[PDB]
Amino acid sequence: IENIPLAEEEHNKWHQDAVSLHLEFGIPRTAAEDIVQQCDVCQENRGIDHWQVDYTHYEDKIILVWVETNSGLIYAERVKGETGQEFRVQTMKWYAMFAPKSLQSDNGPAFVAESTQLLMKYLGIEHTTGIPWNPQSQALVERTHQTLKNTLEKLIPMFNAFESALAGTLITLNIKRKGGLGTSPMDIFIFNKEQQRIQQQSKS
Amino acid sequence: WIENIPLAEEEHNKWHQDAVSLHLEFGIPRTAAEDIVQQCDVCQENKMPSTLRGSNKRGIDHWQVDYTHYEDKIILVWVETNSGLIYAERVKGETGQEFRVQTMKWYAMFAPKSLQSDNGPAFVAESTQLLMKYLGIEHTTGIPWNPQSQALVERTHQTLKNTLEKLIPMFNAFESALAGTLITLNIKRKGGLGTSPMDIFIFNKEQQRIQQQSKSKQEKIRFCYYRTRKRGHPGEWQGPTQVLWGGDGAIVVKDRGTDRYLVIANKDVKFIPPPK
Amino acid sequence: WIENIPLAEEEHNKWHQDAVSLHLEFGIPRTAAEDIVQQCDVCQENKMPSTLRGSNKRGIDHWQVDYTHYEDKIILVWVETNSGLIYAERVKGETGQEFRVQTMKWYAMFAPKSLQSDNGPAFVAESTQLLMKYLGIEHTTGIPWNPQSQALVERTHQTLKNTLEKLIPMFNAFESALAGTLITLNIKRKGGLGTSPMDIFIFNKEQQRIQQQSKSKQEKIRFCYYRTRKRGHPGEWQGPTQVLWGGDGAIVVKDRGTDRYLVIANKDVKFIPPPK
Amino acid sequence: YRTRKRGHPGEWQGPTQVLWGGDGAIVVKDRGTDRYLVIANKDVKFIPPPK
DNA sequence: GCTGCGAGATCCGCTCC
DNA sequence: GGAGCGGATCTCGCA
DNA sequence: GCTGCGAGATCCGCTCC
DNA sequence: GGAGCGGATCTCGCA
Numbered sequence: 001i002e003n004i005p006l007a008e009e010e011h012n013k014w015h016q017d018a019v020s021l022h023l024e025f026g027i028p029r030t031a032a033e034d035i036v037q038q039c040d041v042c043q044e045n046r047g048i049d050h051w052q053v054d055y056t057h058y059e060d061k062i063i064l065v066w067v068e069t070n071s072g073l074i075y076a077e078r079v080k081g082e083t084g085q086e087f088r089v090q091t092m093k094w095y096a097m098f099a100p101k102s103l104q105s106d107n108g109p110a111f112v113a114e115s116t117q118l119l120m121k122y123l124g125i126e127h128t129t130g131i132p133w134n135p136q137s138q139a140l141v142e143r144t145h146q147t148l149k150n151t152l153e154k155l156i157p158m159f160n161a162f163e164s165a166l167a168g169t170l171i172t173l174n175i176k177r178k179g180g181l182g183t184s185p186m187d188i189f190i191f192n193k194e195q196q197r198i199q200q201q202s203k204s
Numbered sequence: 205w206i207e208n209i210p211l212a213e214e215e216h217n218k219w220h221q222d223a224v225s226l227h228l229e230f231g232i233p234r235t236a237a238e239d240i241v242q243q244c245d246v247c248q249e250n251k252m253p254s255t256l257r258g259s260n261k262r263g264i265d266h267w268q269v270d271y272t273h274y275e276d277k278i279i280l281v282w283v284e285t286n287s288g289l290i291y292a293e294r295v296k297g298e299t300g301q302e303f304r305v306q307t308m309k310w311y312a313m314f315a316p317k318s319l320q321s322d323n324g325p326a327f328v329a330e331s332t333q334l335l336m337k338y339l340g341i342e343h344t345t346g347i348p349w350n351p352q353s354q355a356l357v358e359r360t361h362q363t364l365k366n367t368l369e370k371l372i373p374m375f376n377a378f379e380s381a382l383a384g385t386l387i388t389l390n391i392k393r394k395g396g397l398g399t400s401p402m403d404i405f406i407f408n409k410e411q412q413r414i415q416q417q418s419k420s421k422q423e424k425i426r427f428c429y430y431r432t433r434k435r436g437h438p439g440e441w442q443g444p445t446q447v448l449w450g451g452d453g454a455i456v457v458k459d460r461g462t463d464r465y466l467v468i469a470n471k472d473v474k475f476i477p478p479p480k
Numbered sequence: 481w482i483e484n485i486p487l488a489e490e491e492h493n494k495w496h497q498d499a500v501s502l503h504l505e506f507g508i509p510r511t512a513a514e515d516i517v518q519q520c521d522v523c524q525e526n527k528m529p530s531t532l533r534g535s536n537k538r539g540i541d542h543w544q545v546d547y548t549h550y551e552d553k554i555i556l557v558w559v560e561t562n563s564g565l566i567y568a569e570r571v572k573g574e575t576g577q578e579f580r581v582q583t584m585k586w587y588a589m590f591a592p593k594s595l596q597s598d599n600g601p602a603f604v605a606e607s608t609q610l611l612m613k614y615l616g617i618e619h620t621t622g623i624p625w626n627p628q629s630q631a632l633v634e635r636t637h638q639t640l641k642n643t644l645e646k647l648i649p650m651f652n653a654f655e656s657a658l659a660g661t662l663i664t665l666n667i668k669r670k671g672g673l674g675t676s677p678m679d680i681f682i683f684n685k686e687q688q689r690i691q692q693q694s695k696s697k698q699e700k701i702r703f704c705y706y707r708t709r710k711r712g713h714p715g716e717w718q719g720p721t722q723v724l725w726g727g728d729g730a731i732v733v734k735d736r737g738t739d740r741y742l743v744i745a746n747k748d749v750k751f752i753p754p755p756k
Numbered sequence: 757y758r759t760r761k762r763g764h765p766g767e768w769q770g771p772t773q774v775l776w777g778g779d780g781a782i783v784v785k786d787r788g789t790d791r792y793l794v795i796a797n798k799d800v801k802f803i804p805p806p807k
Numbered sequence: 808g809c810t811g812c813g814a815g816a817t818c819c820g821c822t823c824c
Numbered sequence: 825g826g827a828g829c830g831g832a833t834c835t836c837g838c839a
Numbered sequence: 840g841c842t843g844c845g846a847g848a849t850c851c852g853c854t855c856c
Numbered sequence: 857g858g859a860g861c862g863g864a865t866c867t868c869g870c871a
């Protein structure tokens with residue numbers, strides 16, 4: 001209970017981000033978002049289960065890439081072409097495999113349509129389309145693209161199918177790679193999901 | 205007793221009666237009648253096959269994979285034994301390369317430890333076994349012509365087809381219907397105590413971390429003396445054993461001779477003095 | 481409560497969840513979730529058929545008749561429901577005349593009162609129904625394409641074939657083997673408490689004599705007053721009734737309005753004064 | 757947990773809290789007989805604690 | 808205006824010698 | 825404590 | 840050198856208002 | 857005494 005006033009005071013003194021406050025005080029995510037929105041300095045100028053969707057060209061190969069902002073979890077697939085139907089199928093599969101809550105993307109033909117917007121409202125996920133303003137998503141997705149193409153170039157000759165190489169790159173960049181206190185970019189996502197589940201169960 | 209035993213034997217030879225009938229007729233013991241009837245070669249030859257049944261592995265990181273057909277569509281289904289989470293994908297055929305791609309994608313999505321499957325053109329081959337050894341997954345093959353071996357995936361076939369029948373009109377694309385039935389069978393199930401299978405899988409994966417177990421390297425070590433107990437007859441103390449876990453009223457001892465875990469009550473357990 | 485009911489309804493429309501899932505998610509009552517899920521037309525259309533099963537007539541003079549094949553041989557089997565006695569005969573074909581001869585021979589051997597059979601070229605026809613009316617036997621025909629209706633004769637088919645497999649080498653004639661298996665399944669069975677099915681049939685036939693019941697024509701006659709008992713709420717006295725049998729702590733009353741036998745405890749039973 | 761009775765598996769008894777879990781088997785407290793029972797990993801399921 | 812069935816194996820829990 | 829023993833329980837295959 | 844399974848209906852016996 | 861409710865029980869069909 002006192003964690004909410006403590007977080008409010010600390011944000012007034014330092015103006016940190018919501019994820020750090022949630023991790024270090026255990027305050028509800030809604031309270032952290034309310035505190036963030038209530039800061040005029042931050043408003044006038046890294047969320048859990050926040051995703052970014054992008055396309056990638058690889059010497060005529062079309063790759064759809066999904067990047068989680070909080071955790072370096074990358075989901076890559078092969079798409080025949082930029083089409084609304086294919087994007088809707090891919091995004092429904094993506095929602096089938098994970099439990100997202102928000103999405104961010106650029107302004108595109110298949111991205112912006114009445115059918116896909118209706119489908120995403122049907123799923124119940126917040127969508128934000130426009131030019132990014134936080135100078136972190138662009139750099140993060142650029143690093144994701146660079147690492148993904150580097151690993152794909154490295155691992156292509158070992159396997160036969162291109163999808164096989166893509167799966168191998170996903171294995172390398174999601175499980176085998178480690179950082180911090182010996183943690184993987186996939187174990188962090190599981191820990192965050194478990195924390196969200198236990199908080200939701202405790203609250204309601 | 206002994207005198208009428210040949211009479212009962214010849215009567216059963218002539219008519220092939222039952223043991224209960226012989227016992228009730230000639231007064232012979234039930235054991236004697238059972239021995240007589242079980243020794244009949246004719247009865248043994250025409251006896252019905254034994255009915256004993258077992259159960260599946262039901263491991264934590266254990267997965268069962270199978271193919272199925274649905275209106276000129278081929279679906280590959282993976283079923284997790286512990287949580288019950290399922291993963292289905294539409295596959296053009298049943299070639300080895302397609303199965304290899306699908307299984308390594310399945311490994312990429314989450315890390316398993318064992319797989320159970322039946323005989324098949326793609327399940328067992330040269331390249332697929334090499335791939336599974338490369339990934340490091342234990343593979344077990346069931347008895348041929350025993351579809352009951354992979355019971356879990358067979359039941360999930362019903363649970364998937366029945367639910368997928370509902371969502372076909374909603375979506376024009378078959379893959380969309382598959383994703384929707386995955387939603388309604390994985391996240392929106394919330395069966396039992398109120399936890400979806402995905403929640404169980406997430407919890408099991410979270411608690412599987414070994415760094416938590418490696419956090420503490422200091423723990424008290426004690427040794428114990430125990431003896432066996434056969435038919436209530438006490439035995440003899442069998443060496444010193446390291447205590448595995450100490451509770452109240454009982455203890456657990458790992459027998460090296462049988463290499464098995466046993467539980468011993470405090471009345472048959474004694475403790476060596478600690479070092480001083 | 482009421483506010484989230486449309487939310488649960490639309491969620492079930494979108495995903496077709498289960499009632500338990502809706503109750504655990506939105507907190508709606510289990511009854512409300514059951515009503516919502518049962519009102520879904522899609523769920524009703526694809527729901528699995530109901531599983532309720534019954535039992536056979538199991539009458540005293542009730543017989544079930546059926547045909548069977550055994551290595552280019554046709555066997556007609558009659559099974560008595562109560563005792564379990566069986567009677568099998570080799571028949572050249574399945575014509576109506578052969579069945580009529582066999583069934584009237586079966587009537588000649590012992591007198592039944594009812595028969596149960598399925599649809600067939602000879603079981604149902606014009607001449608056979610006339611013959612059964614001539615003999616005075618109630619005939620019942622089971623539901624078509626429901627072989628489970630005549631379960632008793634179907635099980636006796638197994639019990640006959642399995643035993644007949646043993647006695648084929650002993651006798652060169654097939655009819656001899658049939659007679660031997662009739663011996664070993666009727667007289668030499670002696671199953672259960674130690675009474676063969678033929679003994680049960682003989683006892684039931686012996687006690688069926690009506691002259692014993694007609695020996696005594698004098699008996700005390702009494703009348704009684706009783707009332708119904710619904711949910712523990714007493715009703716009103718419903719006319720005078722003739723006592724059927726008087727025991728201790730209870731009595732039996734035949735309700736004419738429902739035409740059924742009921743048991744009433746002494747606390748709800750009173751007796752009219754006897755005539756004086 | 758579940759046990760083998762008369763050569764066939766029994767019903768899924770539980771839920772219950774595990775006491776000690778090692779390699780191969782875990783030890784659990786039974787309510788029917790108030791006795792400790794050791795059961796291998798091939799006939800168990802793992803569930804997070806309820807509310 | 809009606810319907811599933813049991814024979815043949817296997818142990819537990821029992822009490823009695 | 826050894827001992828047999830009555831009975832609940834299991835599957836499968838008649839159509 | 841290993842294996843049957845559960846989803847979807849229906850009542851009883853229960854206790855609580 | 858009305859009331860809902862948790863749980864034991866049933867069949868059938870995946871191969």
Ligand SMILES: [Ca+2]
Nearest residue numbers: 546547627839
């Ligand atoms: Ca038949």
Ligand SMILES: [Ca+2]
Nearest residue numbers: 270271351871
């Ligand atoms: Ca199969």
Ligand SMILES: [Zn+2]
Nearest residue numbers: 011015039042
């Ligand atoms: Zn701020």
Ligand SMILES: [Zn+2]
Nearest residue numbers: 216220244247
């Ligand atoms: Zn014999």
Ligand SMILES: [Zn+2]
Nearest residue numbers: 492496520523
């Ligand atoms: Zn519905």
